[PDB]
Design a protein around this ligand. Sequence first.
Ligand SMILES: [Zn+2]
Ligand SMILES: [Zn+2]
Ligand SMILES: [Zn+2]
Ligand SMILES: [Zn+2]
Lengths: 269, 278, 277, 270
Amino acid sequence: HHEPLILTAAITGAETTRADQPNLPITPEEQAKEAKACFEAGARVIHLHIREDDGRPSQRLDRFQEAISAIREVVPEIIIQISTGDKRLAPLALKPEMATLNAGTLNFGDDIFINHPADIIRLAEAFKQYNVVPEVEVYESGMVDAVARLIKKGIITQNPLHIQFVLGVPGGMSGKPKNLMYMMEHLKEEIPTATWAVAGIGRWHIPTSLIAMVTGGHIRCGFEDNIFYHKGVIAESNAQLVARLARIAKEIGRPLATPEQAREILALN
Amino acid sequence: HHHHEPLILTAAITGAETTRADQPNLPITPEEQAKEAKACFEAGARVIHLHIREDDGRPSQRLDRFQEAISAIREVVPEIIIQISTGGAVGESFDKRLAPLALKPEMATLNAGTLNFGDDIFINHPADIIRLAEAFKQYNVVPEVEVYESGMVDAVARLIKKGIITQNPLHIQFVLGVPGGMSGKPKNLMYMMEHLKEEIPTATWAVAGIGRWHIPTSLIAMVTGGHIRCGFEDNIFYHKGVIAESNAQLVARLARIAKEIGRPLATPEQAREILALN
Amino acid sequence: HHHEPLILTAAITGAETTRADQPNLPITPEEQAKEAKACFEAGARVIHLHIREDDGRPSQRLDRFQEAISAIREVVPEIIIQISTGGAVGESFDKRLAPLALKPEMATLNAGTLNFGDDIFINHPADIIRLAEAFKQYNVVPEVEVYESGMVDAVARLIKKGIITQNPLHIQFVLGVPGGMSGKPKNLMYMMEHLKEEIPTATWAVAGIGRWHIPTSLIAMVTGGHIRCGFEDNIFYHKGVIAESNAQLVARLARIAKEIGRPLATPEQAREILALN
Amino acid sequence: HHHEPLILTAAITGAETTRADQPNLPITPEEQAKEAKACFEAGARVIHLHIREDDGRPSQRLDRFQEAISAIREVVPEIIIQISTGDKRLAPLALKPEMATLNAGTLNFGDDIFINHPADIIRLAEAFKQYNVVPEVEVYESGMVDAVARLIKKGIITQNPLHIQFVLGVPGGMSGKPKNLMYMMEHLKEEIPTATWAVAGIGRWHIPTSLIAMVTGGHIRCGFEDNIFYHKGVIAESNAQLVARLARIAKEIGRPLATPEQAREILALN
Ligand SMILES: [Zn+2]
Ligand SMILES: [Zn+2]
Ligand SMILES: [Zn+2]
Ligand SMILES: [Zn+2]
């Protein structure tokens, strides 16, 4: 609990609605204002999805350019991590430091989140061509082994690789403390040099965050994963969620990573 | 967890993927499957986990083919529990997955989720899992719930809470070692049985260890009260680089280890009681 | 679950901590009462109490226990007093039982022996049984101190034999002693799971000695466990920064619980959870 | 993994087991030598040795240790002798055993206490270095692993790779349930990464500890010191009968037994 802590703010996401969370940033201007407030509260990475003005998900290259440029203008030290979810490669030309790589398929609510093995390989190879570092999203134990297989084949070559555990999806592994303890130990056995962060969906935000705090892990928070500050109490901003984690880190004496330290830990240099 | 509780051995003799090119002893016809089932029962198996194939070796879902295989096995070994799996390969029918449940087998496979599976995807949409679970209740067939990942245990617990899976005690078949799924390393099987105990306290469980995971999963299950599945569906090797000569050879080794450590093999009556088939 | 009430215990003095290392250490009944009131106001619901003579040496004097218990109850009548009746080299075994006649709400019961720094902390199996039987005689609820996995099994065996009959039983894990199990997250996760397997209805708290205070506290926060803090176990607020009071340590835990939305137990809730009624 | 060589240790006599409970208990040097050779032929590569007087009471007599060690070496010179010495307890180390027991801590042990004072652990560890005897470090609890790691850091225990003997199932110590052995091997890997380990499962814990060690790369100790039963309520006929079952299970699963040369290499006895 003395190693620097990297806080990631996943500010918008692809599913969260304004009806449920009226403070959801949707426009590039709103996303830049939120990114600055999050950075000041202690966040060093923004996990970015884009939306159209009506709030529907967007994949428009010009919209990604508008959002990335707006955020970099107000917080140039921020690390931008985009989710682009063969014309889905176009935003990588905007030089994000990182991009999401989903490590597998899972049932996801009353639906299926499909990431075909051939498409995982194709995306991993495209990130290398564009010099973009992967942010590898893992929802289950078997996805760690699948990533280790891609490392052995020389497809995923980033080292130290960064794993983003996403716990609490209906269909995926839950965020109960037993699960996060198992996952970090399993990852240490299978990919010894990998670093990791955890995202705890909804009610799992508090247990995942406090375990990561004292086990050397990093933490992702934000409206993409959780809109509540307390049970039944809507959060006022993503920065409010980041600031609570920063206050707990200050209480226990765990320093927040500087932008330089975050780039070193995540091997972005 | 006690190595004195009866042990149920399941023989998964054919499967949907194993080829004769890799395993020439693979039983594919109802006659071959019946001969293998008798040899497996004599070696200690109490359940046959059955997939059917056409004579050219391709996966089958034909009702008449399931009837031929079930009748052939029951004729030679009426005491064995027949557990059928009703999915097919690319070009399968979804409706044909339900039709063999009408044959009221003692058990049938219920998949608990989707996963990448080798170079492909093994798809089990949440609405289709529910539809199949409802067909099990309609035909009074006991499910054998196949779990490949931690999240599938939570998904099954949700289906119990929703009154979709009403079977109690419920039997979970962990399938470990699939490329894309959870591996069969000892840490994983220990985690899975503990996780299952937390989420579905009355559930029983068995483990299948694909390929090289057959030995670590079997020996851990032996001393933790779990049950064991073996066979050519999951593993074709007796030792590394030594192909198994029959499914009964794999069953017999587990029976010998159980006899060495003093863990009794379940009688057919005990297996039906444990699995709540009466 | 991080929504269940949290019981904070302040172990304010202990048998080993010195004033040379921690000048804010309360040693007299008056000092212990002032600290107990400040800890209660900061969120503590239990005081884990050792007594000392005015020269700072450990005490077992019945009159000294009466002076400390009365002083604390006078200023904070709602707090739960949990006494520890052992002494240092030259202690009396019979004096370990004598304060149970003062009918404290709770008292420490040691579950085993271990090497403890350069010495040995001895608790012979027959003496553990004798003390457990004395708890029943005086209607005192035990606070069972466990330092190793084998001590959980030893307690489960005493329950099976009808020697420890308190149900729900409260286990105090003490992690981080040199000679005992450390407070690393893997260990606390193992211990709560091991306890759930062996004594399913038991409740638990954790004390993390020295550097283990932070990892044990934050894991207990989100696993439904209770937390012990204080100068008996840890004298530092941060690495190389001594704590100014026991209440300073309690208040940090109370602030973290407020941040995450875990309510602090009321005195009534603490007595219900610990089955003191 | 279950392909790494397996070292089987036979703890043939112990300090507590009685002839009343186990009539096949070897007590004399001649009986111990015959049992050691039968165990070696069944697959054992180490003998964990305690000595007794002819009436069966425990012994610490130097001449009795010399008689037992010489008798075993005469009939099975390839076996590794590991003695338990129980401050003139150092005298038998001059008989050049390859290994000797180092108890890593104190614990309640049945209706008694097994005392190993921190200063005495250090004194014994230093003596083993003086006599060039490799320690067999007996661990009964999680905290004993940390205590050993502290002695390594202090330069008191210098053997590397160090061999840890987990002793599970003592009333007062950690039990032999699978959750515990999995925790212990992982805990040891974190705290002493290069250490090797074996497990002894007292009484009913012999089977769960042995089968977990089989498939996790661990080594196994068996024998009348720890367990006298072949099955529940069925007294074993010999220590070699217990060793032979483990050798048969290893053969079934394809785990090779260590040769004497491999056992000396793994245990760093050269
Ligand atoms: Zn995202
Ligand atoms: Zn199948
Ligand atoms: Zn105390
Ligand atoms: Zn011994």
